[PDB]
């Protein structure tokens, strides 16, 4: 066994999980995490991975593209009162 992951390791693992469309969906259609700007702000902070030397550690390149989309969307995305992301209400 290995010791608990580093912050750098935790963030690299996490940004890369966004390469999975279903998972990103499960987040987008959460409730709590969109009440407060924290998560939104976190995802923009994560764009640190998009440039060297960081990007050179990315094995799952799609996650960077999806982060970018996800991010630009969030700027103009309208947040319902509960947390529901407005522009998505019609979809499951």
């Amino acid at each position: 066994q290995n010791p608990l992951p580093t912050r750098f390791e935790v963030e690299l693992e996490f940004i890369q999980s966004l390469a999975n469309i279903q998972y990103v969906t499960y987040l987008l259609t959460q409730q709590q995490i969109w009440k407060s700007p924290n998560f939104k702000n976190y995802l923009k902070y994560l764009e640190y991975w998009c440039n060297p030397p960081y990007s050179q550690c990315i094995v799952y390149p799609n996650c960077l593209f999806i982060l970018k989309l996800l991010n630009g969307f969030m700027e103009s995305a309208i947040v319902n009162e509960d947390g529901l992301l407005e522009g998505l209400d019609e979809l499951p």
Partner: protein, 58 residues
Amino acid sequence: SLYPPPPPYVKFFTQSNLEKLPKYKEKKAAEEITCALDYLIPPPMPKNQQYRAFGSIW
């Protein structure tokens, strides 16, 4: 839910802390985590280039 939650560090990303960041970054210029603001600053690149990606998986 085998889908993990976002990293614990998310709690630090308040709009308050974001406002304090520019001045903090300056002062700094004058693992070593000491306060909340440190989390709003990307972690340093490890020395072992074994974090360099072997290839792509799309």
